[PDB]
Amino acid sequence: PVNSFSGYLKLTDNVYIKNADIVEEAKKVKPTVVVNAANVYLKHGGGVAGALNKATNNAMQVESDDYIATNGPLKVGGSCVLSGHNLAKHCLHVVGPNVNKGEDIQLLKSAYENFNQHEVLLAPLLSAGIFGADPIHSLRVCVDTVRTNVYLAVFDKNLYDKLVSS
């Protein structure tokens, strides 16, 4: 693990952000930890999870299915560390709340608290895809909760611009 992050804008002492594809960042940066925004069953069917899984050539899904079949689902707000395959040493799969389905958005705090067990992480915003949390709000919880060094990758330029102006 090299953690050679570059080109990030510093938002706070420990939160940095970049308009970039998290998969391409992981390949460039060789992070110790890449974060996946997962569901409780680690079914990586779309969004960031699907992109990370595809970049591992489906190995992440094979490993995740085996973990879940033995251990049962994660809790919302919870996480688990699995292999990072070719993307990172470790993948921290974190489950933000599915806000659109009625899960408590306060669980974003719990979800980001999992980042505090790692010195440095490459990560997406949590719950900011199909789970329906306002990305501005998700960033705010991240800033207010995470105390270790988080390098956030935001794919869409318009969203990045909105986040950086907020």
Side-chain angles (χ1 to χ4, degrees), residues 1-29 31-42 44-100 102-118 120-161 163-166:
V2 194
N3 291 318
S4 47
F5 297 91
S6 62
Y8 284 74
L9 177 59
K10 192 162 181 180
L11 301 180
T12 66
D13 284 355
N14 65 294
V15 177
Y16 300 83
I17 192 165
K18 186 179 180 185
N19 183 21
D21 181 336
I22 190 169
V23 168
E24 289 309 299
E25 282 296 296
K27 292 174 178 181
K28 286 176 189 168
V29 161
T32 303
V33 181
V34 64
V35 171
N36 180 33
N39 56 59
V40 292
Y41 302 106
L42 303 181
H44 307 304
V48 169
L52 296 174
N53 181 51
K54 177 177 183 148
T56 74
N57 207 27
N58 201 51
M60 176 182 283
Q61 189 67 75
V62 177
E63 178 193 32
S64 293
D65 284 354
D66 173 82
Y67 178 86
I68 297 290
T70 295
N71 301 108
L74 296 191
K75 288 187 197 305
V76 179
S79 62
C80 72
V81 179
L82 291 174
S83 182
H85 301 279
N86 58 306
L87 300 179
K89 182 172 173 179
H90 291 155
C91 180
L92 177 69
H93 293 274
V94 179
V95 181
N98 186 343
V99 173
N100 285 340
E103 296 180 354
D104 181 359
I105 196 162
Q106 183 62 25
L107 287 163
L108 273 169
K109 179 105 182 159
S110 183
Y112 279 116
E113 283 177 338
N114 295 292
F115 288 25
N116 287 328
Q117 305 309 102
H118 298 283
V120 55
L121 312 90
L122 173 62
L125 292 174
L126 302 178
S127 296
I130 68 169
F131 280 178
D134 183 347
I136 295 177
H137 179 72
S138 187
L139 176 56
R140 285 185 185 195
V141 182
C142 181
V143 164
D144 285 342
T145 304
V146 181
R147 304 176 311 260
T148 55
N149 292 311
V150 188
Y151 288 84
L152 293 170
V154 175
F155 185 88
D156 179 61
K157 182 181 179 300
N158 290 325
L159 179 57
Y160 175 82
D161 288 338
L163 291 166
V164 160
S165 303
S166 72

